[PDB]
Structures are given as structure tokens and as C-alpha cells.
Amino acid sequence: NLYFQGAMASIAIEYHSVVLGMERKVNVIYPDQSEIPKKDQGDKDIPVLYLLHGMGGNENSWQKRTAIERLLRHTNLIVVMPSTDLGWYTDTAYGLNYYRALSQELPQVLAAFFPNMTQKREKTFVAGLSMGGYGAFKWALKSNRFSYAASFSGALDFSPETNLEGNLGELAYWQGVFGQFEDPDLDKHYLKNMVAESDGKTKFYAWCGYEDFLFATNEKAIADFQAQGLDIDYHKGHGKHEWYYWNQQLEVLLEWLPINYQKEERLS
Amino acid sequence: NLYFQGAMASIAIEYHSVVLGMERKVNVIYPDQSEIPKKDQGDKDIPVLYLLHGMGGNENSWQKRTAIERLLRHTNLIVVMPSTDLGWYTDTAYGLNYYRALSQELPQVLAAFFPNMTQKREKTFVAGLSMGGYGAFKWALKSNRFSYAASFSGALDFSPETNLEGNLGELAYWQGVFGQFEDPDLDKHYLKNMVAESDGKTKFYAWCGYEDFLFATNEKAIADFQAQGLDIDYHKGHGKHEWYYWNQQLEVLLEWLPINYQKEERLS
Amino acid sequence: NLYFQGAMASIAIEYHSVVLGMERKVNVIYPDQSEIPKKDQGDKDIPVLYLLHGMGGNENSWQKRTAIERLLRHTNLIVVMPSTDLGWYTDTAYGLNYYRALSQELPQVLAAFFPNMTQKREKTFVAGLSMGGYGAFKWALKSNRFSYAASFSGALDFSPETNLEGNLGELAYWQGVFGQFEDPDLDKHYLKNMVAESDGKTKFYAWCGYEDFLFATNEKAIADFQAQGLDIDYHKGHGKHEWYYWNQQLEVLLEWLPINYQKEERLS
Amino acid sequence: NLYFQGAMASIAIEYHSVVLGMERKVNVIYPDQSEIPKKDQGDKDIPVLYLLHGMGGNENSWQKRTAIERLLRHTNLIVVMPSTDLGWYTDTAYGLNYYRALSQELPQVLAAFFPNMTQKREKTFVAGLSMGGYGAFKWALKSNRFSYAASFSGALDFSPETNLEGNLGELAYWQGVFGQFEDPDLDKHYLKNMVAESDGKTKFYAWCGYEDFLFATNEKAIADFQAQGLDIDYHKGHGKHEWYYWNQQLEVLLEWLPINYQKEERLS
Numbered sequence A, B, C, D: 001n002l003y004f005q006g007a008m009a010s011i012a013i014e015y016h017s018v019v020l021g022m023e024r025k026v027n028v029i030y031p032d033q034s035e036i037p038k039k040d041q042g043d044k045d046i047p048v049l050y051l052l053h054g055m056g057g058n059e060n061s062w063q064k065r066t067a068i069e070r071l072l073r074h075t076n077l078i079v080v081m082p083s084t085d086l087g088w089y090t091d092t093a094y095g096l097n098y099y100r101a102l103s104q105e106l107p108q109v110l111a112a113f114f115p116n117m118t119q120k121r122e123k124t125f126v127a128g129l130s131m132g133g134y135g136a137f138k139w140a141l142k143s144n145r146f147s148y149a150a151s152f153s154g155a156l157d158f159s160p161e162t163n164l165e166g167n168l169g170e171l172a173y174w175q176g177v178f179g180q181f182e183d184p185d186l187d188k189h190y191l192k193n194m195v196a197e198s199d200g201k202t203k204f205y206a207w208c209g210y211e212d213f214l215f216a217t218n219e220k221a222i223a224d225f226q227a228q229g230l231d232i233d234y235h236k237g238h239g240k241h242e243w244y245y246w247n248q249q250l251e252v253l254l255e256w257l258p259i260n261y262q263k264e265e266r267l268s
């Protein structure tokens, strides 16, 4: 017609997690064969971005707060939106092994459903905002699964002192996630303590807004990462802890990744 | 926490349409009691915008192609996203009474589920893009239900000559929607022929991009509407038949409507 | 725990149909690796049942009206639930090519998403109820894609005389689906006229309740099929045009198909 | 047509929980105005059943494992399916206040969306299976909101000794839900300790299968309830910890409740 136009496929999966012992939800956007560049048709090695949500969000957050499905509609990229509830992408002290579920089970589930997604590091990426920025860097440092990793307004440094002081949720919550604050192993949850064992083959990007409550956290964390020689680029701009800025950062991410992003025309 | 933030409620309804004789889907976004201005808490007369999709879309289109759920999250507005398949919001010649289903049944269904939505014209609005711009103006002209109506890149004028010539879909399709092209009643589907009987108490807005295939259609249609004294404001800018521009127009619409839109802060 | 138990994966897909020129929905239930018999783990040739809905239904009908997701949870079977609106799995006279979309596009879409589903006739099955029984037999007769095909209370014979006489919907509806009733090609829609060209390598099953308004239709249709030597088994019982009986027939179907159905224990 | 038939409306709601500080999902089935008995049309006091899931389930469990949407389609009943993750409908020791969210917030959310649901005890009911049987009895004992409450294979008695011994999940899990096992307040989670303060105006029903791992638990719990004079009827049959039996018990529940259940005809 001229009236007709493509769309990515939108897939919502509910599956049984053996790790968590419960039904879990994951959303997947999958490229539109009729709209990607000609060369990409039939691909058996499609690149994949895992995009992680913030505290209070879920598998719908990115899709509803950005117009990601519109942005990517001409691009050869699978995007996976997992859920972690309020568990920080962490195996918690109350027995929910969210990190194991994210890092070990989810990729196996997806591969089993979707053999044509890439299994290559050079085509596997992660990013997230807020709690999801912590999750993205944690997963990339520990797993060496990703070529590129990004944090937007991430909680990239913390301590008991900062978590609680009880402006950021109460003690029982934080100790449920990370263990008791007197446990000498608490520090294993600190991203700075995970750099040494990572392989140094992941590119990192971090952003934070000047006005964000986590701006000081990011300044401190990046300084510590840079001291250890992490391959990181850090940027800042005016902004707060809000989804408009996360949308902007998604659009920066899409150009940074090696995905041949087909940016929509904008005449106004 | 400072980490926590609200969200609108997102409601997906599947219901039995007696008019269409089938299960139908409608999405509704409903304002977050914890985030709207104080005065709006407990409202029993909440304003409502019906937002109509384009050819090939459905009840998910606006939500996935704009970040409407983010934009409206501090605003006291219900938004309803109906579906019409490829039926043009029209009672078709193949027996699917989509116009009756939209104009008569859907509002009764919604009121029955949601008694706290407004029943007032001064708080009831419609808009749509492409086919949905035709639908929005048709519904507003015929029903007098709305105070404000908006069309974005709408198919606001047409004839056999323009539909088909077969660049815009084939004959059987168009005649299925509007009837045989030799029927002397074809012209009842033309928006210009619906102005006389409307009550003149609806404000109209139309937009079209210069580069759009429907730019000439809109120029012609608005000239005809203005000749009949319709209360319409018409604007144009650079743009094509694409969702980025429809997102921009949604943001213009939200300020135009009498809804006390709480626009998100944008520091960059 | 003993408290934990598996579930099939439930997948909801929205995809762009090039054939129909619109976003379409298809549901897929996919076997639980942790619950199927040991031997089936890792299968790259998983059997597939397409299950078609009735007039007024959609891709959710089977899942919500039967407890299919519970019944199949130990069985190595993919089940696909397509949607055809009110189009009878037919390329209609108003330009919606539902048959092409079902028979050609949908299998290619699914294979592209899900390479581990079978591509073998011996592991590919179809069934449906009411309109979906017509669709199941039509698709199996025309395509030779299936080893087994089943109709439950199907509209397996019809004419203008029976459609309309206007007890079963009005003329414009029926002629929109099948063309004008005076067209000499109307009879190409009759299943009896499709037997000659089918390959005779599909097993057919049909059921109808004695009290159903289509009981006479089924008696006539099966007699005509049996006259042509179709490989069909036909059964009847007390019942009407209702989902309880369709649930019962699903359970009969699951034993008939060569799928090694792992029937749940029922101690009461 | 005779081909057309009604359906209940199926509503999926995602809403912001202030209590939990996260987006939460609740499903609602709402009666079909065209199919309920004549007298019920226009009701502003529609009865409501809350139906709670088991460990590992969610808001979709009842709908997918029973054909509840089919069973209730002629009946004037709203059914609400909440989610509690693995939190036992309890304000947990890791800071997720699931009980407050269920008992205080959810009813206010639903009333705000759906003013025509009843606010009367005589028309408000709860039931659940496994963990959800514990939840149903807990909520009914504490709140006095319900006239009728039902448990199917519920975990109605427990201790450290039985939880763990580590056949039923590990220590960290159970202590995350209920607190440390040495806390003298552990016993506040025991349903037997909640009877004294309840008002004695709720009717209780419990079922358990003989072969279920919780059969001894139910025998013990009911004996303790009967010693305290609770108004309870307890039944047992052959069965295990499986959804087929929960489906059977749902069908018993529907006749027990004062809802004028319109049971589907079953001629076979």
C-alpha cells in the first residue's frame, strides 16, 4: 500500500526456572526479516543485547518506557529483557539464586528456544539502568560472556554506610539481598572486587547525570575502576534518575555496539 | 529509597463483542494514584483519550512505538487503545460492524468496567494516526461525543481514483471496507460529507508531514473542511508516514488537550 | 521441595504478517525439558500439533477453555494456536488471505524462530473445532503437510441454502468469506471437492455430538468422504456445540496421535 | 449464528505497588453481561472470589491449569488471581511485605479500578491450593473480610522440624520467609495461633488427598482447628499434590459458595 510497514516480532515467554523453582517471565524482541538490510536475511548468528531493568521494574520496563521496538525495527538485533524482581541480579541471602538464573539458566533456555541467536562473545552485549547497571557490570565482569557492557545511572559503588543510613530502603531489605552487613564476605558483592579476576576483554561504558543521587557513587566507582586499568569510558550530562535519560542512553548504546544500527530518519 | 518511582497501571482486556461476534482486545492505561497531582486523588470523573491505530496495527501500537506510559505517568488521564484490524473503523461490506463496535459498544463496556472514567464531553478526546486519523475525525463528526479530536497524517480525503489505481492495496480490499465503488452511497464514507450533520462543538486538529504520500490528501481535505466552517487547526512540518513523527504529535496533543499534562523534566 | 513442579513454556508471539499486511498473534506451548521423558531431552525434531479455534475465538481459546498446558506438561509436543479472526482459514473475497497466511507464512515464521520443531510430516498434526474443524481438514487436504488431522464438531459440509437462510449469520458476512453465492467457483470451498487432489496419506478423525446443530452436516460430509475413499474414522456421542466436549475430544486426540502422551494420573 | 457464544472478560493488570515498591501483576475474570442470568445484568455488588496460587506459580496458574474461564462463563462472579512469588502471602524477613500488599493494598486497588465489585463480606470469598491454602486461611483468620474460605492440599501446619529437615527447600529460604527459627515470634506464623483472635464468622473448607505428602499435616492441622471450635468442614479423597485434583476442588468450591453457579451441561 505505502500504508503498510514492518514491525519486529515481540515475544513474551513464561518458562519454568529450575534454578529459582518458579515460573519466570522474559521478553524478547526479534528482528523483522522484511525490514533488516538484505545481507542479514537468514542469519544463524544474530547478535543479542541483554537489557536489564531497575529497582521496581520488570521484563516490560524497557519496552514501555522507551520506544525500543520502533527504534530497532530496521536493525538485525535480538534484545532480551529478563526480570530479577528486587533481587539485584544476585544470589540472595533468602535463597533466591537470581544471579545463577540470569547467568547460567537463562542463556541455556534462550538457546534451546532460539538456536539462531549468536553464541559468540563478539556479538553478545549487556546494558542496564540503576540496579541494572550494577547487574550489567557484575555479569560482564564475572562471566566474560560479553564484548560490550553498559551502565546507565548504575549503583556501581556501595556500602552499608550508604545503603542504610535508611534513606535508600531498610536494613532488612538490604541484608536480604547482600547478606548481613557484618559478614566478612559482604565485599564480594562490590564490583571493584571483581575486576582482578575478569579477563580484561570487555569494553565498558558508564553514564550518570550530574543531578542524580548516584552521581557521587559513579564518580567514586569509575575512579576505582580506572585505577585497576579497566577498559571503561565514562560520560556525564545533566540529568536525574529518570527514564527519559535512559532512553537517550539507549540511543547512544545502539551506535556504540557493533550492530550496524539502522537509525530512523528524523526530518524534524 | 529514592530508587523507587511510580508507574501508570497498564490494563489489557479481552472481552466478548456482541456487535462483532468475537473476542476483542482493548488496552487501557490508568493514572497512578501515587504520582498524579494531589487534587486528582479519588477522582470519579477522570478524563479519557481514545487513541486509534493505523493500518496494520492494533491495541499495542501506541504503547510500543511511543513511550506514552512514561510520558503520562504524572498526569490524570485514562488512555484507551482499541483495535479495528484492517476495517477502517467502519461497518464494512463483509459484515463486520467495526464502527458500531467502536462507537456504541466499546464505551459501554468500558463504563461498565470502569465507572470512575468521565462521561462528560468536556473531558473526552480522540486522536489517531493514518487510518486512525480518518477514524478519529469520523467518530468525532458523527457522535458529538468528544470535545477535541486529532488526526496525524490521516487519510482524510479519498476516492476510487486514488485508493486504486493499485498503489495503495487492491480493489477487493477497498471494496470490502467501503462497498462497491459504483454504489451511489460510497460517498457517505467521505469525511467532507459528514460535517453538515455534526454539531460544530468539537475542536479539530490535523497534522501532516510535507514529504508524506498523504500530504496532498490533507491539503485537499482541510481546504474542504475550512470551506464548510469546521473548527480546525492544521499544521505541517517536515516528515513522512512514520512513527517518530506520530510520537512528536502525541506530545503536541497532550499540551493541547485540557488535561493538565505534567510534562517530564528534560535537562538534556 | 516436593512443593516444586514443572510447567511447559508458554510463548506469546506478535509478528508482522507480510501476507495479511498486519501484526498477527500466535501462541505456542513448548515442552519443559525437566519434565518430559529422559530420551526426549535435546530433541531437534520435536513434534508439532496446530490447534485451530472456532468462530469468535482466537489464539487464547484452547488455552483458556481446556487445561491443555496442564494436560501436556509431561509430553514432548509443541502446540501452536494460530488466529484467523472470522475468516474461516480462507483467502476471503475482501482481500484478507488467511489461508495463505496459515499455510505458507506461519510455518516459515515458526521455523525461523524455532529450528528445533520438526519439519517431518510423520510428526506434524492439525486439529480444530467448529470453523476450525473445517480449517483443519481443508489445510490437511490441500497441503499434504500432516500425518493426522482432526475435526471436532466441524462445519464440514455447507451450501448457500444452509449458511443463509439467515439463522447462521447474514448474507454479506458469508459472501465476504466465500465469495458471491452465484459465482461458479463457490464450490471450490467445499471440502468434498478437495479430496481428489489430496495425496491419501493423511489419517482423518471426526467427532460430532448428536444434539449439535451440525450433526446432520457431519453425517452428510462423512458419507461423502467415505464414498471417495478418504481414510477417516468418525465418531459420535451425546453433546452439543460446547467447549466441554471439545476438551474431551482433545484428550482423545492426544492418545490417537503418535506423540507418546504422558497422561496425568487420576486417582479420583 | 448459533455459532457464536459468549465469554467472560479476561483482564490482566500491571500496577505500581507502593507497599512492595515494584510493578505487580494481578489477573481478573469478569462476568459476561450477555451470558449471566437476566436478573444479574447491571449488578453493582458483584461477588468476588480471590484464588491464590501455590509455590512456583503466579497470577496465570489457575487460568492455565483449570478451564476456570469456561466453567464460570454463565455465572455472576468476579475472580481475582494475585501473585506472591515465593513469599507465602507473608511479610517476609527480607523486607517484602506480601501480606500487607495482599490484604490492604490489593483490595483498594481493585475497588478503585472496579467500583461495581462487592464490598460485602457475604459476597467475598477466598481459596487456594498448597501455599495458597495457607494464605487463604491466614488471610481469612486475620482479616475477617470473607464469608467463605477454602484450602486445597494446604500447608496448614508446620515447624522447623518439618520444613527443614531439608527435603522441603533449604534453611535460608524458609528463614527468609518466616524469620530465624530461633525467634520466639516464629509461632505467630502458625495458623493454629490465629484462631483465637478471628471473629468466628467465616466458614472454612479444607481438602487433602490421602497420598499427598501433606496429608499428615492436614490431619494434624484440622484436629487442632476443631479443638478450638473453628467452623470447618474437612474432606479427603485419593489424590496427590497435583493440579487435576485442584481443578476438582475448584468445582466443589463453586457449588459451596453462595454464587448461584451455572454449571455447564455435560451429556457425556
Ligand SMILES: O=C([O-])C(=O)[O-]
Pocket: A266, A267, A268
Ligand atoms: O532530532 C533532530 O533534530 C533531527 O535529527 O532532525
Ligand SMILES: O=C([O-])C(=O)[O-]
Pocket: B266, B267, B268
Ligand atoms: O529537549 C530538550 O532540548 C530539553 O527540553 O532539554
Ligand SMILES: O=C([O-])C(=O)[O-]
Pocket: C266, C267, C268
Ligand atoms: O477419571 C477417572 O475416573 C479416573 O481415571 O480415576
Ligand SMILES: O=C([O-])C(=O)[O-]
Pocket: D266, D267, D268
Ligand atoms: O460427567 C458426567 O458424567 C456427566 O455429568 O455426564
Ligand SMILES: [Zn+2]
Pocket: A233, A234, A235
Ligand atoms: Zn568517551
Ligand SMILES: [Zn+2]
Pocket: B233, B234, B235
Ligand atoms: Zn495553529
Ligand SMILES: [Zn+2]
Pocket: C233, C234, C235
Ligand atoms: Zn473408530
Ligand SMILES: [Zn+2]
Pocket: D233, D234, D235
Ligand atoms: Zn462435609
